[PDB]
């Protein structure tokens, strides 16, 4: 029922600045807030967001994560002169105070709570708060790293008290380790904290031993703190996506959070002087997209770091673009993560193996810098086209339409019939192939339609016309097929990759085919492991121009189909055609709901998969990780 996205911002939070010479602090400028909001207005996305006003966090709310002594000390900063502000800033590590910073800190804290309230009251589906100062370094009785009050820690504690939440996921993709959040929920199993950060073997700020992968929590909360250290600079998009596919996402979907809060620091992007990483701003459009199936889309993005004004504006827009449901941009050049990233990923999975069932099999035997500008993201005129069987009226979302076949398309279906299948008069089939071409032409060519779903009766003839027609308009087509037969699909030229979900196991020889024969109780948990750990890594590296989904009528376990078509829309700018053999009102409504960008129901309590399933999946990884390096979650054995 939730509708749009909130953007909480106020110019007042940019009215404090550093007043003395401090080489460690001069990068935290008010222009980070000005450039970020001005970039959203330039791209027209600010106007597309509901501008929820900011408020001050009350004293009672600040004490949720801070002590009375620390709050009382900061409360007297508005009355201090410059010399007194210098002496107060020296008591903490890499932070400066201003006459207006206590005011702005309460606004940054209150703005975060306004976003949490808007999301939890179903007034919006998600949102972002462009706040300042940041927070994830702030501790109970100390300011730290430009942070006065821990904004994200407030949001989690605030959502727990006023909404009785049991599970909250915090994703910290800032380039620094948010040790203030880790200290706050160190013993709390209700708040799962994930953070990657530039570590360089503790040589990078804040130089903390507990910032390493070994800190998994304490007491009842052990296993709910996940640190992923970067021990070398220059981490690429492949490193960031390997962290998501092989660490964060398997844990997040098993956790099943009721609310997702993001410590969105963009100093992990290309060109930032503090992060020195090499990920392009478009990667944040996917980091946001891969998390939105969680918690029915209830996602609160809180601005943290980001100090390259050009890179910051681009990364903010890519985040809001995905939150508004705009199609995700294509990511090319993906491959294996570097050895340092694979070592970090390998170590985190090993330590966490005793806590999460996605890693449980790893525990015993028999297991001036310049970059190109991002392209223009644009939502289609109508996102989804639905073609039900002849004479079936349906209730469609406001951004959907039905199929009329023009005479230009009607002549093509004939030419296809007089050449191939020249003994085909089933006029019902001829209409479906006419629909397939009409929807595909509106997908690939004109920017009017994003994706679509077509109900078919013949499978071999329909998938042939769909696949062959897509390979001639321009390039690369990924095929996801849930059935047991054999389809006229040739994985010969490297232009097609086929993912097959069947019942009987088939010895696969081509490295362009991924066959998943999953055993029937835990078919939901096993499918999600294969989706996050196998299907998504190869699909992202393959980088298709169109996704072709096929479901035969014999196929049942449909609870996972909504998550697949939502996550798989990260490929091919969301251009996905789904062919459903036979009519199923529930399955058709599920496909159209997820294709349209609506939220998906959580999977609930995710159990543990069968050992025979994880064994089959790891044998597929061994067979394919040499060709598709993004599948790797360990360091390669050198000859
Ligand atoms: C969410 O806050 C944004 C941030 O994480 O980027 C803040 C950390 C800056 C602290 C680093 N000081 C420079 C090192 C010189 N000793
Ligand atoms: K982080
Ligand atoms: K925790
Ligand atoms: Zn940072």
UniProtKB/Swiss-Prot annotation:
The gene is hdac10. Pfam families: Hist_deacetyl. Its EC number is 3.5.1.48, 3.5.1.62. It catalyses: N(8)-acetylspermidine + H2O = spermidine + acetate; N-acetylputrescine + H2O = putrescine + acetate; N-acetylcadaverine + H2O = cadaverine + acetate. The active site is at 137 (proton donor/acceptor). One of its GO terms (cellular component) is cytoplasm. Substrate binds at residues 22, 94, 307. This is Polyamine deacetylase HDAC10. Keywords: Cytoplasm, Hydrolase, Metal-binding, Nucleus, Zinc. The record marks 274 as: Substrate specificity. GO terms for biological process: epigenetic regulation of gene expression; homologous recombination; macroautophagy; polyamine deacetylation; spermidine deacetylation; swimming behavior. It is an enzyme of class 3 (hydrolase). Zn(2+) binds at residues 174, 176, 267. InterPro entries: HDAC_PDAC, His_deacetylse, His_deacetylse_dom, His_deacetylse_dom_sf, Ureohydrolase_dom_sf. The keyword Membrane does not apply. GO terms for molecular function: acetylputrescine deacetylase activity; acetylspermidine deacetylase activity; deacetylase activity; zinc ion binding. Polyamine deacetylase (PDAC), which acts preferentially on N(8)-acetylspermidine, and also on acetylcadaverine and acetylputrescine. Exhibits attenuated catalytic activity toward N(1),N(8)-diacetylspermidine and very low activity, if any, toward N(1)-acetylspermidine. Has a very weak lysine deacetylase, if any. Its main location: cytoplasm. Belongs to the histone deacetylase family. HD type 2 subfamily. A motif (Substrate specificity) lies at residues 23-26. Changing residue 94 to A: No effect on steady-state kinetic parameters. It is found in: Cytoplasm; Nucleus. The keyword Hydrolase applies.
């Amino acid at each position: 029922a939730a509708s749009g996205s909130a953007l909480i911002f106020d110019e007042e939070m940019s009215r404090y600045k550093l007043l003395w010479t401090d080489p460690a602090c001069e990068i935290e400028v008010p222009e980070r807030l000005t450039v970020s909001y001005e970039a959203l207005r330039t791209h027209g996305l600010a106007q597309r967001c509901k501008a929820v006003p900011v408020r001050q966090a009350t004293e009672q709310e600040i004490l949720l994560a801070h002590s009375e002594e620390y709050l009382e000390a900061v409360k007297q900063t508005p009355g201090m002169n410059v010399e007194e502000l210098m002496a107060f800033s020296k008591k903490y590590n890499d932070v400066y105070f201003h006459q207006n910073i206590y005011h702005c800190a309460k606004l940054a804290a209150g703005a975060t709570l306004q976003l949490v309230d808007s999301v939890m009251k179903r007034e919006v589906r998600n949102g972002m708060a462009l706040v300042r100062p940041p927070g994830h370094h702030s501790q109970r009785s100390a300011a730290n790293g430009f942070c006065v009050f821990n904004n994200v820690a407030f949001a989690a504690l605030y959502a727990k008290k006023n909404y009785n939440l049991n599970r909250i996921l915090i994703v910290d993709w800032d380039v620094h380790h948010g040790q203030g959040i880790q200290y706050c929920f160190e013993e709390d199993p209700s708040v799962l904290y994930f953070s990657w950060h530039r570590y360089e073997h503790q040589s990078f700020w804040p130089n903390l031993p507990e910032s390493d992968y070994s800190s998994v929590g304490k007491g009842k909360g052990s296993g709910f703190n996940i640190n992923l250290p970067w021990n070398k600079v220059g981490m690429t998009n492949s490193d960031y996506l390997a962290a998501f596919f092989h660490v964060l996402l398997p844990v997040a979907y098993e956790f099943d959070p009721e609310l997702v809060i993001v410590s969105a620091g963009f100093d992990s992007a290309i060109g930032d002087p503090e992060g020195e990483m090499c990920a392009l701003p478009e990667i944040f459009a996917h980091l946001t997209h891969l998390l939105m199936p969680l918690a029915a889309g209830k996602m609160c993005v809180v601005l943290e770091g980001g100090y390259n004004l050009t890179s910051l504006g681009q990364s903010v827009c890519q985040t809001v673009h995905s939150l508004l449901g705009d199609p995700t941009p294509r990511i090319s050049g993906l491959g294996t993560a570097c050895d340092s990233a694979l070592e970090s990923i390998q170590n985190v999975r090993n330590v966490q193996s005793s806590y999460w069932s996605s890693f449980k099999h790893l525990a015993q035997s028999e297991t001036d810098i310049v970059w190109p500008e991002p392209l223009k993201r644009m939502p289609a005129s109508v996102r989804t086209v639905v073609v039900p069987p002849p004479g079936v009226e349906l209730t469609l979302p406001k951004n959907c339409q039905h199929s009329d076949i023009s005479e230009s398309t009607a002549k093509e279906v004939q030419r296809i019939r007089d050449k191939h299948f020249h003994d085909l008069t089933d006029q019902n089939i001829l209409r479906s192939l006419g629909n397939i071409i009409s929807v595909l032409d509106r997908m690939m060519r004109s920017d009017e339609v994003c994706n679509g779903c077509v109900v078919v009766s013949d499978l071999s003839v329909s998938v042939q016309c769909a696949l062959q027609h897509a390979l001639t308009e321009p390039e690369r087509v990924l095929v996801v097929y849930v059935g047991d037969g054999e389809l006229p699909v040739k994985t010969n030229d490297g232009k097609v990759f086929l993912v097959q979900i069947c019942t009987k196991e088939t010895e696969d020889k081509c490295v362009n085919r991924l066959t998943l024969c999953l055993r029937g109780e835990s078919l939901t948990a096993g499918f999600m492991q294969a989706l996050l750990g196998l299907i998504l890594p190869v699909a992202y590296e393959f980088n298709p121009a169109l996704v072709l989904g096929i479901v035969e009528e014999t196929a049942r376990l449909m609870r996972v189909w909504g998550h697949m078509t939502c996550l798989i829309q990260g490929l091919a700018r969301g251009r996905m055609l789904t062919l459903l053999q036979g009519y199923d009102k529930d399955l058709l409504e599920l496909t159209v709901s997820a294709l349209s960008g609506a939220s998906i129901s959580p999977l609930g309590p995710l159990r543990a998969p069968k050992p025979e399933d994880v064994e089959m999946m790891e044998k597929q990884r061994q067979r394919l990780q040499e060709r598709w390096g993004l599948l790797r979650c360990t360091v390669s054995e050198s000859w």
